Ligand binder design. Structure first.
Ligand SMILES: [U]
Ligand SMILES: [U]
Ligand SMILES: [U]
Ligand SMILES: [U]
Ligand SMILES: [U]
Ligand SMILES: [U]
Ligand SMILES: [U]
Ligand SMILES: [U]
Length: 517
């Protein structure tokens, strides 16, 4: 942290943050969500990290170069160490990216190495070549070299993601799936794991071996797993919580803005809220049904009437303010809701649905006050505007993500947040073979447009190709875009260091500090 001259620090430097739910895991190769990444960034540090404003900056790598955007050479600082005092080396990165690639690890983020185009990844994921063929090598203990199969000018932007953080081979090999227990885990970020009580709390304590430990201020941070946004706000206002999770309750937000305006932080966020349709299951494999659902949802009611927290009605998957996004707003978005409704009804009647044999399906969402209220409103809108019946189902976070990967579902509430600020961070997840493709969407046309983006060495052509990729997605109604998020959360006046300038919201508790109060 960089504490400003003149600020008086509190004697006790502890922090309590709500983290939305129980994490899937603390293993960097078994995670895919925001709650998981919030904890991962304090524990495991990759080649680069985001600075306090979100710019990619030195992590374990103090400096790096590229050759033709294809061969990337990372010079690792000599004093990077794990929490047991052993050096962090380029061999750790070799083992770790190989483990991420290995199909036996079954990482949800296995395709992140496809997104970066590391050499031989397709064959490794397919079981054709062993993980040791991956295009990574340690030239020495402090030099990590990555070889890509094509020029990727934005490659380094990907490297702040937790899936490309190192994992300690001896602990993994010795303890298998219990390697992340507090008695066994070893970490190289600013913090170490102290306590982990499922469904109660995760407590981290400063890691004195962290190379940048002298600048760390917070000695202990607790992450809670509270999925009720109302309860989160209540325990923030009671004094227990210093920073809520960034999901705000419909019950209280308007009141909060008038009561504690200075604590209500609202900033740009590169995330999209949408209803994910299971494209491989009838009757959702019919474009008419997916289009009808997409058009009949009334975004103005949901966004400005039922939620009204600053979100913007959405007509695409990639948020339009992503760096490199130059999207074409579809004509249906400018129509009246009435005109959308008639088209939707017309399509469902064409698809064979009637008053007597209506369309009925499940709407799955992760336990939450906010998602439940939005799902109920969506259910009523769809009933009124299209005659469709939905059965709401809630599931805890970890189980919910597993259901979507399983493709045991009809429609699910969903949200994707960028891992790097570039349209492919969104678009690559809709590729036929992507490990993140929970829409189970498979379009050769869509795959071709994205493949073509690294075959040109021109930014305008790439942006035009991303615009057309969004048009293909929309044409197929792969999803139901709902709104582009704002990052809305409460932060106590004494929490210093949170700028709200990072559109990815990649916070590191090593950057925060507690002001005397
Ligand atoms: U004190
Ligand atoms: U650039
Ligand atoms: U940029
Ligand atoms: U269903
Ligand atoms: U509630
Ligand atoms: U460029
Ligand atoms: U105080
Ligand atoms: U105190």
């Amino acid at each position: 942290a960089d504490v400003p001259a003149g600020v008086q620090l509190a004697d006790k430097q502890t922090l309590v943050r709500n983290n939305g739910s129980e994490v899937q895991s603390l293993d960097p190769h078994k995670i895919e969500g925001v709650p998981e990444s919030n904890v991962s960034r304090d524990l495991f540090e990759g080649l680069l990290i985001s600075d306090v404003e979100g710019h990619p900056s030195p992590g374990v790598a103090e400096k790096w170069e590229n050759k033709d955007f294809k061969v990337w050479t990372f010079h690792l600082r000599e004093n990077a160490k794990w929490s047991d005092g052993t050096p962090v080396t380029a061999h750790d990165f070799v083992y770790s990216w190989q483990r991420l690639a290995d199909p036996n690890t079954a990482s949800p983020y296995a395709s992140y190495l496809q997104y970066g185009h590391i050499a031989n990844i397709d064959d490794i994921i397919a079981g054709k070549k062993p993980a040791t063929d991956l295009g990574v090598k340690a030239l020495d203990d402090h030099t990590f070299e990555v070889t890509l199969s094509e020029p990727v000018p934005y490659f380094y932007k990907l490297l702040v993601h937790p899936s490309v953080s190192p994992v300690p081979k001896s602990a993994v090999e010795k303890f298998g799936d219990k390697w992340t227990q507090p008695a066994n885990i070893v970490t190289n970020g600013a913090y170490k794991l102290k306590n982990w009580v499922v469904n109660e709390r995760i407590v981290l304590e400063r890691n004195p071996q962290y190379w940048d430990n002298a600048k760390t201020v917070i000695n202990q941070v607790t992450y809670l797993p509270i999925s009720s946004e109302v309860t989160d706000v209540n325990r923030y206002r009671s004094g227990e919580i210093d920073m809520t999770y960034n999901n705000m309750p419909i019950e209280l937000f308007q009141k909060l803005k008038k009561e504690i305006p200075n604590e209500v932080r609202v900033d740009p966020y590169l995330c999209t809220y949408y209803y994910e349709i299971n494209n491989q299951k009838a009757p959702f494999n019919d474009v008419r049904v997916r289009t009808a659902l997409k058009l009949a949802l009334d975004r103005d009611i949901i966004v400005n009437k039922v939620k009204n927290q600053g979100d913007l009605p959405a007509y695409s998957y990639t948020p339009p303010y992503t760096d490199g996004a130059k999207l074409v707003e579809p004509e249906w978005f400018k129509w009246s809701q009435q005109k959308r409704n008639e088209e939707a009804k017309k399509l469902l009647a064409e698809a064979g649905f009637t008053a007597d044999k209506p369309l009925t399906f499940d709407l799955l969402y992760n336990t939450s006050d906010l998602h439940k209220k939005l799902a109920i409103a969506v259910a009523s809108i769809w009933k009124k505007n299209l005659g469709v019946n939905v059965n709401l189902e809630n599931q805890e976070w970890k189980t919910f993500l597993d259901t979507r990967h399983q493709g045991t579902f009809d429609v699910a509430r969903a949200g994707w947040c960028a891992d790097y600020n570039e349209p492919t961070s969104f678009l690559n997840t809709m590729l036929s073979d992507s490990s993140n493709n929970t829409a189970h969407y498979k379009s050769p046309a869509f795959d071709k447009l994205i493949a073509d983006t690294l075959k040109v060495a021109d930014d305008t052509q790439r942006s035009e190709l991303y615009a057309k990729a969004e048009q293909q997605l929309d044409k197929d109604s792969a999803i139901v875009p709902v709104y582009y998020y704002v990052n809305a959360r409460l932060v106590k006046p004494w929490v210093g260091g949170y700028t709200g300038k990072d559109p990815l919201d990649n916070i590191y508790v090593k950057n925060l500090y507690i002001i005397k109060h």
